[PDB]
Structure 1
Amino acid sequence: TKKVLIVEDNELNMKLFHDLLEAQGYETLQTREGLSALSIARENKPDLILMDIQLPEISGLEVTKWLKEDDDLAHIPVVAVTAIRGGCEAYISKPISVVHFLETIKRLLERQP
């Protein structure tokens, strides 16, 4: 099953992103901090990283820079959520459009090997 790591400090956004992804049958990993995202990514190898750029403690774009500098994490597609192209494969605007949100993520997640 595909695993998506959601990096989102806002409880409401995290729940919405989680519910939408779970309804699609995906497993998720969750964290409110950019640094933790790096740690979790190395420990659980998510298939895609959904990251809010406007985190309170750090820019999501700087976190993406670290991701791309790591040989084990650089291949993981990163979708930025902003209220980028930093290394992000795609961007999703907030307030989000549910279909656009899911289409963007599924396109990057569900590719033939």
Structure 2
Amino acid sequence: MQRGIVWVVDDDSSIRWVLERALAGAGLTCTTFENGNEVLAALASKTPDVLLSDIRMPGMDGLALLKQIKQRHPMLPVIIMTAHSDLDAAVSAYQQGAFDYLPKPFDIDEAVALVERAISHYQE
């Protein structure tokens, strides 16, 4: 079947576009929102393939809506970039989680695709 649906969360408008642009050549459904909140506001029902989150943001902090993302849709495969101040929202990974840390560098399809397989790999 191939194809996938990655709903990642960036920081502000014009950021979700940039990605989806490099994600168009691949031909995937890389939906990106501005805030981790609004993100689960659209997935309120349940993520499609895998959720993701960057480590950038305005000022200090680093997306405090991470623990939110999970609280909504089940713990389906996800992926949070490295980050320097996210370690807090990440700590909730080893504790019954389904996503590790993504370091650099990584291509757009290299990332998206990679997940596409995970999502349908360990289902035992």
TM more than 0.5? yes
Q: Mark the runs of 5 or more structure 1 residues left unpaired by the alignment.
A: none
Residue 67 to residue 11, structure 1, CA distance change in 2 (3 Å): closer
- Aligned equivalents of 1:12, 1:69: Cα separation in 2: 27
Conservation of the 8 A alpha-carbon contact between 2:6 and 2:112? no
RMSD: 3.1
Equivalent pairs, count: 107
Partner of 1:19 in structure 2?
21
TM, length-normalised to structure 2 = 0.62
Query: How far did residue 81 of structure 1 move?
Result: 6.5
TM, length-normalised to structure 1 = 0.66
Query: How far did residue 9 of structure 1 move?
Result: 2.5
Partner of 2:55 in structure 1?
53
- Aligned equivalents of 1:81, 1:89: Cα separation in 2: 9
Residue 32 to residue 55, structure 1, CA distance change in 2 (3 Å): same
Q: Which has the higher contact order (CA 8 A, sep 6+)?
A: 2
- Identity, % of aligned pairs? 15
More helix by share: 1
More strand by share: 1
Partner of 2:100 in structure 1?
89
1:32-47 alignment, distance < 5 Å: 32-43=34-45, 45-47=47-49
User: What is the one-letter code of the residue matched to 2:62?
Assistant: S
